[PDB]
């Protein structure tokens, strides 16, 4: 027979021996059986390496607990494939493409292999078009790109997922195209909450959800992103639809890859990561892109281990993005939401040629004031503003008001604070921050600028606090 | 001259004729043991 047998099992990695001439090709899906009662299941293994002597090293998509050496392994002759089509919208899937909410659904759909090459370089078209969100900090300092790639970096508990939900609320609700959400190595209860919320907001019918969460073997965690990306790619290429691809969290894909690489016997790279870290990142990320005339607006949450932005994973992630919002623990501690680091976040379309001269000038003045404020933090931490000159004192007051004003009562933050969110038009944001930089609100209290929308809210809160605008 | 059919019967007979598991500790150290045998584990 042309079937193999398990020879070694080391965690979620299995070595399978095949008769000569029947060795499966790399990335082929194989099936094995676990028979023990509680854990009885059909393991899907992905061929990862050819070891020689007709042995292949494979990554299991399910826990290999209960697997026995010598069990038969069958080669399906093809890589993992997931259902595609408009039918996937409104449903929840796992990495292998099984439907969770309606088991057995989609078996008759067209199936696409989750492995494919990125678009040809000649088909790539740079995208420079501002996607307005209504968030003052995002719109002003790190404008998002429609059809571009956006990332939200941040440590643990700084508001990455809340910001992803905020952008789903602001961008996806009033969206005519398709949305694909990829939960990668994140809380299962978060996935359930997102599913319920999307159903409540009547956005689920236009959304496809693919969840591979924390309680999964590393193989599933490092292939679920590919599954969701394949669904998005079908929507982009085979239907000419505008696509929103939400991923949370991509660092989990990288970390699962690191665990898999450790299992596979590769020599570790710096900080214990897999040697092929940048390469796996690159293939996955360059599959996420807008080709000429076909738009994918992807937004990805990137976890930063131990608040270490120097860690190889986010460091290699940075290069694949058009807009980068770096959330800061320091900003989070001050209660400022979203906890954006204005001096660390960036956008490729924040230049005068694209956003105009007024937007650019106001943003650059805000950044200059905040940078000068950060430079003084050493003196202020010891002596306070009292030792600074008059010019520095004025700039410090202006910068504190600016940093308060960059905060905003978010739409998704209502569940926490109970206060409804607000949207700020881009022109109003530019004008308000222009006035702030000039110094037309230097007399109001700082708290008047905390967690509000435009200038009307600023005036109302100043009145409540006893000041006048 | 090749039988092309006796091969299957012969291999089946050999495996059948060849057919509690008890393993043996081959080495032990620092909370890790290695056990030879137990092919059905």
């Amino acid at each position: 027979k042309t079937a193999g047998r398990v020879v070694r099992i080391t965690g979620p990695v299995v070595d399978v021996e095949f008769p000569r001439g029947s060795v499966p090709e790399l990335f082929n899906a194989l099936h094995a059986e676990i028979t023990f009662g509680a854990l009885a299941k059909t393991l899907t293994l992905e061929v990862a390496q050819h070891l020689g002597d007709s042995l292949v090293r494979c990554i299991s998509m399910q826990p290999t607990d209960g697997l026995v050496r010598g069990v038969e392994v069958t080669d399906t002759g093809a890589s993992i494939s997931v259902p595609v089509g408009d039918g996937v919208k409104g449903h929840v899937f796992n990495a292998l493409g099984d439907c969770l909410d309606d088991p057995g659904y989609g078996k008759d759909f067209e199936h696409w292999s989750i492995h494919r090459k990125p678009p040809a370089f000649s088909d790539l078209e740079p995208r420079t078009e501002m996607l307005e969100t209504g968030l003052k900090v995002v719109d002003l300092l790190t404008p998002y790109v429609r059809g571009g790639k956006i990332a939200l970096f941040g440590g643990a508990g700084v508001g990455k997922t809340v910001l992803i939900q905020e952008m789903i609320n602001r961008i996806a609700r009033n969206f005519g195209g398709t949305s694909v959400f990829a939960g990668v190595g994140e809380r299962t209860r978060e996935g359930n909450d997102l599913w319920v919320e999307l159903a409540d907001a009547n956005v689920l019918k236009d959304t496809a959800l693919v969840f591979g969460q924390m309680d999964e073997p590393p193989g599933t965690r490092m292939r679920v992103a590919l599954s969701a990306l394949t669904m998005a790619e079908f929507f982009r290429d085979e239907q000419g639809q505008d696509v929103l691809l939400f991923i949370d969290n991509i660092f989990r894909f990288t970390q699962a890859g690191s665990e898999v690489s450790t299992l596979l016997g590769r020599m570790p790279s710096a900080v214990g990561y897999q040697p092929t870290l940048a390469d796996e990142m690159g293939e996955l990320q360059e599959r996420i892109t807008s080709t000429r005339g076909r738009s994918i607006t992807s937004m990805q949450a990137v976890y930063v281990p131990a608040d270490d932005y120097t860690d190889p994973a986010p460091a290699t992630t940075f290069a694949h993005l058009d807009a980068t919002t770096e959330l800061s623990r320091a900003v989070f501690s001050k209660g400022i939401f979203p906890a954006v680091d204005p001096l660390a976040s960036s956008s490729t379309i924040l230049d005068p040629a694209i956003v105009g001269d007024e937007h650019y000038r106001v943003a650059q003045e805000v950044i200059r004031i905040l940078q000068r404020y950060k430079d003084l933090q050493d003196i202020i931490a010891i002596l306070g503003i009292d030792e600074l000159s008059e010019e520095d004192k004025q700039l410090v007051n202006r910068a504190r008001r600016i940093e308060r004003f960059l905060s905003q009562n978010m739409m998704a933050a209502e569940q926490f604070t109970g206060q409804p969110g607000s949207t700020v038009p881009l022109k109003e944001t530019i004008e308000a921050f222009d006035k702030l930089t000039k110094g037309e609100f230097d007399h109001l209290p700082e708290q008047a600028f905390f967690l509000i929308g435009g200038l009307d809210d600023l005036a109302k809160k100043a009145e409540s606090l006893g000041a006048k605008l | 001259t090749i039988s092309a059919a006796d091969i299957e019967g012969a291999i089946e007979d050999y495996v059948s004729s060849f057919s509690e598991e008890i393993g043996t500790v081959i080495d032990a150290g620092d909370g890790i043991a290695h056990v030879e045998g137990l092919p059905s584990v």
């Binding site: 027979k1 008769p19 000569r20 001439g21 | 001259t1 090749i2 039988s3 006796d6 091969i7 012969a10 291999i11 050999y14 004729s17 060849f18």
Partner: protein, 50 residues
């Protein structure tokens, strides 16, 4: 010819290739399966068996 037929049936070659199993059992297998047949040279039979 024996090498050709062994290559044709990789499963049989792999089964014979497990030094863990007793030598006598595999020798008997080969004798009563391939080596021992009417149209087999005695010298080749003994050489392959050893």
């Amino acid at each position: 010819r024996f090498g050709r037929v062994l290559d044709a049936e990789p499963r049989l070659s792999a089964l014979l290739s497990d030094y863990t199993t007793p030598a006598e059992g595999r020798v008997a297998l080969l004798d009563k399966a391939l080596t021992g047949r009417p149209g087999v040279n005695q010298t080749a039979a003994a050489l392959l068996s050893q």
